[PDB]
Amino acid sequence: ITQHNRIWALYRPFANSAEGITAVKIWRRYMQVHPEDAEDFIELLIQCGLYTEAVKKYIEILNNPKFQSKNAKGHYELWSEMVDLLVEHAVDIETGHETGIDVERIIRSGIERFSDQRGKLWSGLATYWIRRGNFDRARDVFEEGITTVMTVRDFTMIFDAYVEFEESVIGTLMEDFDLDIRMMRFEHLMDRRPFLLNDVLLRQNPNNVAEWEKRVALWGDNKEEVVKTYTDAIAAINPKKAVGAFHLLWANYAKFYEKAGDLRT
Amino acid sequence: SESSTKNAALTAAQERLARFRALQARAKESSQQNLKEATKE
Amino acid sequence: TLEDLEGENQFTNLARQHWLNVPQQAAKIKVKTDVLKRELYLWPGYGEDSSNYHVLLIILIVNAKRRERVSTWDIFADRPADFSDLFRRALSMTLDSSLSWTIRTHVLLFIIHAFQSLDYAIVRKECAPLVSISIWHNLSTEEKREALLDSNPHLRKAWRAATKRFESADDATKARLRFDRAWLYSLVLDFLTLLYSGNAKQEHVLYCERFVEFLTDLQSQLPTRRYVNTLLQDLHVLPALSLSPIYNDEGNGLLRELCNLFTHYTYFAVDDQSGVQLSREQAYDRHCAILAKLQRIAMKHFKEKLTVLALSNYGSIDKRSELEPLLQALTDDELVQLSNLMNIRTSYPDAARIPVDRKFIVEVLLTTFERRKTFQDAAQALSVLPTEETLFDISLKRTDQYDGSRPLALPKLNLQYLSVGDFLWRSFVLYRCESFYAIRQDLEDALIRLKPEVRRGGVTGFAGFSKMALPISKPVILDVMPPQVGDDKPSCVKAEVTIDLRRLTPQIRRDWESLRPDDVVFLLAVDASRQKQSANGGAVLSEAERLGLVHVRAAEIIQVLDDKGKAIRDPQAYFDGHTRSDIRKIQLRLDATSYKADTEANRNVYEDINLIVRRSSRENNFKPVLESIQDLTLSEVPLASWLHEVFLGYGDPAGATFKQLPNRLKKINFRDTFLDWQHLVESFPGKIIEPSDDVSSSFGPPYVLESVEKQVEEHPSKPSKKRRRDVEPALMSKVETLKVSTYKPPNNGPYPVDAPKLNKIRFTPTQIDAIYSGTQPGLTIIVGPPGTGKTDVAVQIISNIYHNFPEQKTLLVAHSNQALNQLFAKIVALDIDERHLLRLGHGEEELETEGSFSKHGRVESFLDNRQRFLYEVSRLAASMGAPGAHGNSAETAGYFNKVYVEPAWAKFNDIIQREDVGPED
Amino acid sequence: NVIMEEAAQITEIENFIPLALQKPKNGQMALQRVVLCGDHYQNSPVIQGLAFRHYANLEQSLFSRLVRLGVPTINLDQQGRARPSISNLYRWRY
């Protein structure tokens, strides 16, 4: 084994000078005994164009919990680099059940593991879908990320990426039914953005009665929406730890129902 | 008619461009508001 | 049953009073009225003048024979006109509602048995018009039929051929075809009317279950499914059954499960016309196209009320709850207009009186727009590890209590399948159900032997003694690995379980201490105090609640350790030696999905587990089989195209043979398959066999047979168009020229051990043909009785494949260890190398062969052969005067043998290449 | 090349497992010869579940299904193990 390691160290320059598929096989044989240079093997595969092999090697390295990076590379940084490589090579890398490369499942696993950048992960998935040409999949991913963002920065980044993609699509189309549907969905998202922001704020801190009052003001003349927002604020906000203006919330609820024109209820 | 149809298509394209510009301005304002809200958070 | 029908029954008395009213003075002989004798007397006497009672009795006898696995298609195929008349009478009785519900259920069961017996020519001919294109002619919308004809040119050609046949037919044949189509339509309408009538009894529920099973069987058979799925989609049978009060009853769990199975079979991801299995991407694309068409129809029809519905995404409208408010916003008239614009039957016939309201239309639209997972997703969602709910399921209890009186919602294996993935999923479901039933039976036996009860302080104790179960404390989790890439569940969750074997017997202690790695065990939390609530008169307890078992979690024991936490290096020395402590520790990997579900739902099953149940080594291999079945179902390509076409039961069944495959071998070296030329001539009758050389004398073994096809000389005859009607196509057998070639076998050395083994068995011509078919590429089936030399023919075919194709790999599959040992002995008797022969199996099995074919035995044989070869190489180097120790290592022996022999062999070949060198030189 | 013996006594899933033991190469399987030697008149595989054996037809084998479908099979007509009386008693079904 020690002589095999010495022979591998001696033939590493020979494998580097040989290049190509022979060097890929030599690197695989070396990683069969010494897999510490798997990052160098992935770099050589990227230099040779083996995106699927590099993705499989990264998945195998992430599956092993005892794997330590030689260059002190973080697991989150490696996952972000793999996501960026998948987004930049969404058409070059073949995705299917035969190769075992599931971009959506891996993105969901990364968002569940890293919920701080889950909105950024959804934005990256939307960018990968845009690079793959699936505009409907990118729009659905953006909608799911907007509806599942508990972070203000991640939601803002996802909304900015979706707005940039929609603006690029509108500029490309202007210079039929699908574009109109995308524009209507973007208009509905812009209309419900205050509601989504209020929901995200209530998820972060439901105790903000001032935020609930701002949401009720943003509801406007829709009386059923206004009534259900007060009932949700009643059921959600604990008065023992509320931080907004709960007494003013009951006050303008009373004002709204008085201007409605009834007294008893 | 091929002349009035072209004028109607041009008017529809101008209305779509104005709507796209208004949507872009609203998206910029919403992005600024979201950045302010993120800074507040 | 047969004995009940043999007795003095009402049907037998009616048949005696009606058909046995002859005035002949028969002798008073006490002859038993056997079912076979009655069937023989009624079948020859069956005719067009027979009453409906005789047809009902024949249908009941056929159903009893099918339930008892007795063939009845040959007796009906003896008289084809009588069988056709009986089938027409049965179809008329099934279409007629004047008969009782039991008679209708019996007729439906007979029709389902006939459909499952479609391999018979008479049954296939009778069921051909029922699943023909006449069902598409009876569609609700003619525009949908026109679009279906325009989409598939083959469907349009079939419809045109059916229309031409109906127009060219007489009154009788056209009336029969219209009667069959109207009988199918009236059966669907009567099923809908019975479902929507309400106040259904047990007979009505049984008839509905039989109809659901018949629909599932029709959807299973693809040639019938290609029209049955379209008919069910046009008639909206699923929305009618969902809104039916019979399926809404709490007691109709089996009916609901059968309806779910029929819906899954109807919504299978496979092409109805082409027969190609659709992937998840194809189903997603079809759902997206349907959603886009619905959005376009909404934008062109009701864009004011359904602006949000037509402006949303595919994922925001595929949910029934998401689309519920959009449908509630629209009115009933708008929904009816949308259904009419989508070629959906929003109105039924007045005879069926099917209620078509706004709720029914909303349910139909929700079912049509619902996204359904593929069969691969359903197979992946199924858990291989059984649980407490999976073992004590209502479907498993119904299958355990099943006796053939009622249908079951389980997959059925037949001659034809919708897809290879569908068949793999059906086999996986059947294996999982069998494993769950076996695990439930083992757990019930262990709980009965343990006899759990409530001790002092409320602690659940065990009164009886069970050998396969042991009381244990709460296990402690040792480690939890991180989740894998793309997998929510963890990679591994290893825990430690403490067991005691002081009170156990020495055999039980030895069996527990010698547990194999990754052995399937169940950690069971059981409390028998709640069974006292069953004594209180509360709710009806289940089998697990009556037995006291509360929860069960599967796990795989990987290693067994002593009381000090050290692994036992020598198990034989530990068993023979005196153990200092009787307490042992076992490391077990828990189910990752079950542990994740328990942690997410905050379930402390591991902190309450009070028993551990093991099983036998042979009976605990269902988990790997289920995993392999799930992997095969999830695999896109599990077999070759020709093998999948042959296994699917579609197309020509002889297409996988060597005569139809394009990769047939022209010349095959039989070597020593034929003992002599006379044996080869007798084994190849009816075929012209001539020698390859010009010598007319017969040649012995070895022989190579080449099947050279004789070229037909196309003479320049005039194209006479007169003699073309009476000239039928003669079935002239293609006499393949069997060219026999003889070659001198190469010598393997002057030693007597170098002589190759030759076959000394004179094979029959059928055995020779089977060996020739097996040697040629393709699919071969050898039907051999006991004592027909099937093992010898298989060994000869394996030897021929090894000799002809050294680069090919042979995979022998056996069912018993004795058969594998006999095959190994036959291969050793033949010219098969022991180094290339290997056996796969458990290492504890005794090897009946003279040589050990296991991995350790093969390694030992290879080491002995290496030592012998090293000694021979050292002797050869000493004889040749080669300096050094050439027999030290195998690589050194090869290098020395090359560097010595290769120049020497080259010099010898150069000396022999000279024309002046004689035999002495 | 894969050759199976007593295919009627083995399940269809167990028979298809040996045909899919190797992964396909370039979208196609490497199997070329598939031989199945058995006797459809022999005993079927044992199934613990009565409903699975009868209603679900889990006891049906791949060789029996291929024989019922109409696949071309070679039938051996020579027996040399038992006595002529026992062979003739066993030749009634064949």
Short mmCIF file of all heavy atoms in Angstrom, two decimals, chain C residues 84-114, unseen atoms left out:
data_model
loop_
_atom_site.label_atom_id
_atom_site.label_comp_id
_atom_site.label_asym_id
_atom_site.label_seq_id
_atom_site.Cartn_x
_atom_site.Cartn_y
_atom_site.Cartn_z
N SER C 84 -70.91 -20.02 -28.20
CA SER C 84 -71.28 -18.67 -28.63
C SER C 84 -72.71 -18.33 -28.22
O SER C 84 -72.98 -17.20 -27.79
CB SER C 84 -71.11 -18.54 -30.15
N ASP C 85 -73.63 -19.29 -28.34
CA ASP C 85 -75.01 -19.06 -27.91
C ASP C 85 -75.09 -18.86 -26.40
O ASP C 85 -75.85 -18.01 -25.92
CB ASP C 85 -75.89 -20.23 -28.34
N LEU C 86 -74.31 -19.63 -25.63
CA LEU C 86 -74.28 -19.46 -24.18
C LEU C 86 -73.70 -18.11 -23.79
O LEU C 86 -74.18 -17.47 -22.85
CB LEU C 86 -73.49 -20.60 -23.54
N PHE C 87 -72.65 -17.67 -24.50
CA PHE C 87 -72.07 -16.35 -24.23
C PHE C 87 -73.06 -15.23 -24.56
O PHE C 87 -73.15 -14.25 -23.82
CB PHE C 87 -70.78 -16.18 -25.02
N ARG C 88 -73.79 -15.37 -25.67
CA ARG C 88 -74.81 -14.38 -26.02
C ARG C 88 -75.93 -14.35 -24.99
O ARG C 88 -76.42 -13.27 -24.62
CB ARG C 88 -75.36 -14.66 -27.41
N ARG C 89 -76.36 -15.52 -24.51
CA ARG C 89 -77.39 -15.58 -23.48
C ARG C 89 -76.91 -14.98 -22.17
O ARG C 89 -77.67 -14.29 -21.48
CB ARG C 89 -77.83 -17.03 -23.27
N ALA C 90 -75.64 -15.22 -21.81
CA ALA C 90 -75.08 -14.62 -20.60
C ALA C 90 -74.98 -13.11 -20.72
O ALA C 90 -75.26 -12.39 -19.75
CB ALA C 90 -73.70 -15.23 -20.31
N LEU C 91 -74.59 -12.60 -21.89
CA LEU C 91 -74.54 -11.16 -22.11
C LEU C 91 -75.93 -10.54 -22.05
O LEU C 91 -76.11 -9.44 -21.50
CB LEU C 91 -73.87 -10.85 -23.44
N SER C 92 -76.93 -11.23 -22.62
CA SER C 92 -78.31 -10.73 -22.55
C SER C 92 -78.83 -10.74 -21.12
O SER C 92 -79.56 -9.82 -20.72
CB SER C 92 -79.20 -11.58 -23.45
N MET C 93 -78.49 -11.76 -20.34
CA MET C 93 -78.92 -11.82 -18.94
C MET C 93 -78.22 -10.75 -18.10
O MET C 93 -78.83 -10.20 -17.18
CB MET C 93 -78.66 -13.21 -18.37
N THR C 94 -76.95 -10.47 -18.40
CA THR C 94 -76.25 -9.41 -17.70
C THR C 94 -76.80 -8.03 -18.06
O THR C 94 -76.87 -7.14 -17.21
CB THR C 94 -74.75 -9.48 -18.00
N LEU C 95 -77.20 -7.85 -19.32
CA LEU C 95 -77.81 -6.59 -19.73
C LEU C 95 -79.21 -6.43 -19.17
O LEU C 95 -79.64 -5.31 -18.88
CB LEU C 95 -77.83 -6.48 -21.25
N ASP C 96 -79.94 -7.53 -19.01
CA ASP C 96 -81.30 -7.48 -18.48
C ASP C 96 -81.27 -7.28 -16.97
O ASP C 96 -80.52 -7.95 -16.26
CB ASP C 96 -82.06 -8.76 -18.83
N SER C 97 -82.10 -6.35 -16.49
CA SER C 97 -82.20 -6.07 -15.06
C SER C 97 -83.34 -6.83 -14.39
O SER C 97 -83.58 -6.63 -13.20
CB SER C 97 -82.39 -4.56 -14.83
N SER C 98 -84.04 -7.70 -15.12
CA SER C 98 -85.15 -8.45 -14.53
C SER C 98 -84.65 -9.54 -13.59
O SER C 98 -85.39 -9.95 -12.69
CB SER C 98 -86.02 -9.05 -15.64
N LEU C 99 -83.42 -10.01 -13.78
CA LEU C 99 -82.87 -11.04 -12.92
C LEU C 99 -82.47 -10.44 -11.57
O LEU C 99 -82.40 -9.22 -11.39
CB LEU C 99 -81.66 -11.70 -13.58
N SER C 100 -82.21 -11.32 -10.61
CA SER C 100 -81.82 -10.89 -9.28
C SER C 100 -80.39 -10.36 -9.28
O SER C 100 -79.63 -10.53 -10.24
CB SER C 100 -81.95 -12.04 -8.28
N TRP C 101 -80.02 -9.69 -8.18
CA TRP C 101 -78.68 -9.14 -8.06
C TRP C 101 -77.63 -10.24 -7.93
O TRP C 101 -76.50 -10.07 -8.41
CB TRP C 101 -78.60 -8.19 -6.87
N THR C 102 -77.98 -11.36 -7.29
CA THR C 102 -77.05 -12.48 -7.19
C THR C 102 -76.78 -13.10 -8.56
O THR C 102 -75.64 -13.47 -8.87
CB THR C 102 -77.59 -13.53 -6.22
N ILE C 103 -77.82 -13.23 -9.39
CA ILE C 103 -77.65 -13.78 -10.73
C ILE C 103 -76.82 -12.83 -11.59
O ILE C 103 -75.99 -13.28 -12.39
CB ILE C 103 -79.02 -14.07 -11.36
N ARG C 104 -77.05 -11.52 -11.45
CA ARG C 104 -76.25 -10.54 -12.18
C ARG C 104 -74.79 -10.58 -11.74
O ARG C 104 -73.88 -10.46 -12.57
CB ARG C 104 -76.83 -9.15 -12.00
N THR C 105 -74.55 -10.74 -10.44
CA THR C 105 -73.18 -10.85 -9.94
C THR C 105 -72.51 -12.12 -10.44
O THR C 105 -71.32 -12.11 -10.78
CB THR C 105 -73.17 -10.81 -8.41
N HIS C 106 -73.25 -13.23 -10.49
CA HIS C 106 -72.70 -14.48 -11.03
C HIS C 106 -72.39 -14.35 -12.52
O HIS C 106 -71.36 -14.86 -12.99
CB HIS C 106 -73.68 -15.63 -10.79
N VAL C 107 -73.25 -13.66 -13.27
CA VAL C 107 -72.99 -13.44 -14.69
C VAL C 107 -71.78 -12.55 -14.90
O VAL C 107 -70.97 -12.77 -15.81
CB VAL C 107 -74.25 -12.86 -15.38
N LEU C 108 -71.63 -11.52 -14.05
CA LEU C 108 -70.46 -10.65 -14.13
C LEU C 108 -69.18 -11.41 -13.78
O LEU C 108 -68.14 -11.20 -14.41
CB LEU C 108 -70.64 -9.45 -13.20
N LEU C 109 -69.25 -12.30 -12.78
CA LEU C 109 -68.09 -13.12 -12.44
C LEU C 109 -67.73 -14.08 -13.56
O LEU C 109 -66.55 -14.30 -13.85
CB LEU C 109 -68.36 -13.89 -11.14
N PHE C 110 -68.74 -14.66 -14.22
CA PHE C 110 -68.48 -15.53 -15.36
C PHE C 110 -67.87 -14.76 -16.53
O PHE C 110 -66.97 -15.26 -17.21
CB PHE C 110 -69.78 -16.22 -15.80
N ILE C 111 -68.34 -13.53 -16.76
CA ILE C 111 -67.78 -12.70 -17.82
C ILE C 111 -66.34 -12.31 -17.50
O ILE C 111 -65.49 -12.26 -18.39
CB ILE C 111 -68.67 -11.47 -18.06
N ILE C 112 -66.05 -12.04 -16.23
CA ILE C 112 -64.69 -11.70 -15.82
C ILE C 112 -63.77 -12.91 -15.96
O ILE C 112 -62.60 -12.77 -16.33
CB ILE C 112 -64.69 -11.14 -14.39
N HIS C 113 -64.29 -14.10 -15.64
CA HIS C 113 -63.50 -15.32 -15.82
C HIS C 113 -63.24 -15.60 -17.30
O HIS C 113 -62.17 -16.09 -17.66
CB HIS C 113 -64.21 -16.50 -15.16
N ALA C 114 -64.23 -15.32 -18.16
CA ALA C 114 -64.03 -15.48 -19.59
C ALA C 114 -63.02 -14.47 -20.13
O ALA C 114 -62.22 -14.79 -21.01
CB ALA C 114 -65.37 -15.34 -20.33
#
